[PDB]
Design a binder for this molecule. Structure first.
Ligand SMILES: Cc1cc2nc3c(=O)[nH]c(=O)nc-3n(C[C@H](O)[C@H](O)[C@H](O)COP(=O)(O)OP(=O)(O)OC[C@H]3O[C@@H](n4cnc5c(N)ncnc54)[C@H](O)[C@@H]3O)c2cc1C
Ligand SMILES: [Cl-]
Length: 381
């Protein structure tokens, strides 16, 4: 007997922001999740996420990051959970040998972002704790920083519920029935209908979009993150150790200063195990790689951070072939909105994406172009 204006399937990073957008406008909204978000089975746990603005992956990302950033400052104001801490973000790599660093430096120049440029010994003088060869260069964004992604979800959820959004937890959606006039979901806990549907199931999008007759290659990856006891006089946020995303010989790594004395957190970005989200092994340390790829970085470039392993999390990316997101209406149903394929770099945009989703759902359009996220683009395959 339960008919909603909008149903959101998957109330994680994207879905919970979308639900908050909709509920804020008095849209009667049901959010359905396989768990009880924020949880540790998806792509949003491990405590912290980088947001940075000098986004070389495409010009369209730059305004989405800056809008997202403003929206995270707004969410900070609205809630008692902590959202954002402005640690700055350091990008470094070997000079002339890093398309990532080069593209980062261009987007900054091209969008007039405020940034510092440094190189070689300057990097280690500015942040003791960093040890790079004298041939490395860097670009520091002083105004970006670190999101607390689980708090962001919890905040969006509390605020959506306050305005009347319903969240059906521990309920896996199993199928979809889409008419021109409604949408329907089927679950072990019952069926629900609405005018509009947003689909944002994170890694499970790779198995479940076929239920909507779509065939999009989406590869989920096993991505671990470890938290290490650290020299606080070098890696503490309080001494301006930055968040970072850097390129070295064996690939790209990301990480976070120590907050509250808890330990530097680090992740290896360019490698992960190909997995299925239902059979992923979420134990940190089951492959020797989990800890060794991270120590290999630490001992070379951040040796005072290479302490006892305090904790590891196992999390998931869901890549498209072009590593761009998919944000678009279903091509055969204008009442179904798809958010998928965030490719290991979506969380920072999740506030802005929630806004864009809520617009697609309510109007079939959004205020700025979004064509690089087209579900009909050919490089998706
Ligand atoms: C280790 C790691 C570090 C990262 N670091 C960064 C970073 O520093 N900066 C950054 O921008 N991004 C980062 N990312 C990526 C970012 O976290 C993801 O791109 C983003 O969270 C994707 O959000 P989502 O809503 O698609 O998925 P999720 O937040 O996982 O949400 C999808 C939801 O769908 C639910 N669901 C699944 N199946 C069903 C079903 N059948 N029925 C109902 N519900 C279902 C799941 O329970 C889940 O809650 C990182 C990711 C990882 C794994
Ligand atoms: Cl992802």
């Amino acid at each position: 007997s339960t008919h909603f204006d909008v149903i959101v399937v998957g109330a994680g990073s994207m879905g919970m922001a979308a639900g908050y957008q909709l509920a804020k406008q008095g849209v009667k909204t049901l959010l359905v999740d396989a768990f009880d978000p924020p949880h540790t089975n998806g792509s949003h746990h491990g405590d912290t996420r980088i947001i940075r603005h000098a986004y070389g992956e495409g010009r369209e990302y730059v305004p989405l990051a800056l809008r997202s950033q403003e929206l995270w400052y707004e969410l900070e104001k609205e809630t008692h959970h902590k959202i954002f801490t402005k640690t700055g973000v350091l990008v470094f790599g070997p000079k002339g040998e890093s398309a990532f660093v080069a593209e980062t430096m261009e987007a900054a120049k091209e969008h007039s972002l405020t940034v510092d440029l440094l190189e070689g010994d300057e990097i280690n003088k500015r942040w003791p704790g960093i040890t790079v060869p004298e041939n490395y260069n860097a670009i520091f964004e002083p105004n970006s920083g670190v999101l607390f992604s689980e708090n962001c979800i919890r905040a969006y959820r509390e605020l959506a519920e306050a305005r009347g959004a319903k969240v059906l937890t521990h309920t896996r959606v199993e199928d979809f029935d889409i008419s021109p006039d409604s949408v329907k979901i089927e679950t072990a806990n019952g069926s629900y209908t609405a005018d509009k549907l947003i689909v944002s199931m994170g890694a499970w999008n790779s198995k479940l979009l076929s239920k909507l007759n779509l065939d999009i290659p989406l590869q989920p990856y096993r991505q671990v993150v470890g938290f290490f006891e650290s020299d606080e006089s070098k890696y503490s946020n309080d001494i301006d150790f930055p968040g970072f995303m850097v390129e070295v010989p064996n690939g790209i790594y990301y990480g976070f200063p120590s907050f509250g004395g808890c330990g530097l957190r680090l992740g290896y970005h360019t490698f992960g195990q190909k997995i299925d989200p239902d059979t992923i092994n979420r134990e940190f340390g089951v492959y020797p790689e989990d800890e060794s790829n991270l120590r290999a970085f630490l001992e070379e470039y951040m040796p005072g951070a290479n302490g006892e392993l305090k904790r590891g999390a196992v999390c998931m990316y869901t890549k498209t072939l072009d590593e761009h997101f998919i944000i678009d209406l279903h091509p055969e149903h204008s009442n179904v909105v798809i958010a998928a394929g965030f490719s290991g770099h979506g969380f920072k945009f999740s506030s802005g994406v929630g806004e864009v989703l809520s617009q697609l759902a309510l109007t079939g359009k959004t205020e700025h172009d979004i064509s690089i996220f087209s579900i009909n683009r050919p490089a998706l395959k």
